[PDB]
Design a protein around this ligand. Structure first.
Ligand SMILES: [Cl-]
Ligand SMILES: [Cl-]
Ligand SMILES: [Cl-]
Ligand SMILES: [Cl-]
Ligand code: NA
Lengths: 118, 12
């Protein structure tokens, strides 16, 4: 856990697990992700926490899409953290999910502008 | 990777 995820506070485990399992079966070429801003990161907050993303989507393209979504400058820093490790920009969401998904069948990603976060 | 948009990330 790269963060204290608000999503986990607001949804009980078995509801999460049942949903993540169902979604993995229904959409085998996508992976269910929870994306939350690090709490003290002074950057834009996303409106939604819960996403279903292409398994072949790279981290680098996700960064680009987030920049476009929240108007985070091309020149400013943006990092993902999965279990406190920053994935390479070439990593895919499917690769990260396979290695790091939780027991509720979701992958949890924190984002921040701070390289040394956590 | 193929080109994706924000809408490709939507919870269904
Ligand atoms: Cl699919
Ligand atoms: Cl948003
Ligand atoms: Cl949400
Ligand atoms: Cl890359
Ligand atoms: Na939010």
């Amino acid at each position: 856990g790269s963060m204290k995820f608000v999503y986990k506070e607001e949804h009980p485990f078995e509801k999460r697990r049942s949903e993540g399992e169902k979604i993995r079966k229904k959409y085998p070429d996508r992976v269910p992700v929870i994306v939350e801003k690090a709490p003290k990161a002074r950057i834009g907050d996303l409106d939604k926490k819960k996403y279903l993303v292409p398994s072949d989507l790279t981290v680098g393209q996700f960064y680009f899409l987030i920049r476009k979504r929240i108007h985070l400058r091309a020149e400013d820093a943006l990092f993902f953290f999965v279990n406190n490790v920053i994935p390479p920009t070439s990593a895919t969401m499917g690769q990260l999910y396979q290695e790091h998904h939780e027991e509720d069948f979701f992958l949890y990603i924190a984002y921040s502008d701070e390289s040394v976060y956590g | 990777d193929a080109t994706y948009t924000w809408e490709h990330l939507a919870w269904p």
